[PDB]
Ligand binder design. Structure first.
Ligand SMILES: Nc1nc2c(ncn2[C@@H]2O[C@H](COP(=O)(O)OP(=O)(O)O)[C@@H](O)[C@H]2O)c(=O)[nH]1
Ligand SMILES: [Mg+2]
Length: 169
């Protein structure tokens, strides 16, 4: 099968940087509509089963990005809601973002992971591992911390996404 995994969240959290750690073949305007710019495709093996995974980084801020956020929600098989552990403001918006996704696909059970990125930036940390874990508990979803910069837990993130999807299948 083909799985479509969508990186979403506030600007600056590390969505594009996370996308780059997937190691996928990057799309472009020449391969629109199915592999546009800011998409990354790769065949991967998870738990002895291969899947073609397309990782999307098209969650654009502002009015001009509305149709892309809609396309993102309409077509995603799973959603990675990314905040930065160095940016409490991004963390604070996690529940609203999650509820918009859930409410926007009311007939579907949406596979989601809450991603606390920039875990390497110890000096700049504003949100704790514990806090992020607790909010995920509250919101009924899996939590993981990543350093997109160091590729720490990034294999686990994308493998986890595939697992999330398979467990509704
Ligand atoms: N130290 C550190 N910096 C990061 C990490 N992820 C992203 N960055 C940096 O944060 C900035 C914003 O990241 P970017 O991927 O463009 O964020 P986006 O707006 O969510 O796409 C860039 O300068 C990245 O290099 C991380 O895990 N650790
Ligand atoms: Mg970006």
């Amino acid at each position: 099968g083909i799985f479509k995994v969508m990186l979403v969240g506030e600007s600056g959290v590390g969505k594009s940087t996370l996308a780059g750690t997937f190691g996928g073949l990057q799309g472009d305007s020449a391969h629109e509509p199915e592999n546009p710019e800011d998409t990354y495709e790769r065949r991967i093996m998870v738990d002895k089963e291969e899947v073609t995974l397309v990782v999307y980084d098209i969650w654009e801020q502002g009015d001009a990005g509305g149709w892309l956020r809609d396309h993102c929600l309409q077509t995603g098989d799973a959603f990675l809601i990314v905040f930065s552990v160095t940016d409490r403001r991004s963390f604070s918006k996690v529940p609203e973002t999650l509820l918009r996704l859930r409410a926007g696909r009311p007939h579907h059970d949406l596979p989601v992971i809450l991603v606390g990125n920039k875990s390497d930036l110890a000096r700049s940390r504003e949100v704790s591992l514990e806090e992020g874990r607790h909010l995920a508990g509250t919101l009924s979803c899996k939590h993981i911390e990543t350093s997109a910069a160091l590729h720490h837990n990034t294999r686990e993130l994308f493998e986890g996404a595939v697992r999330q999807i398979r467990l509704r299948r």
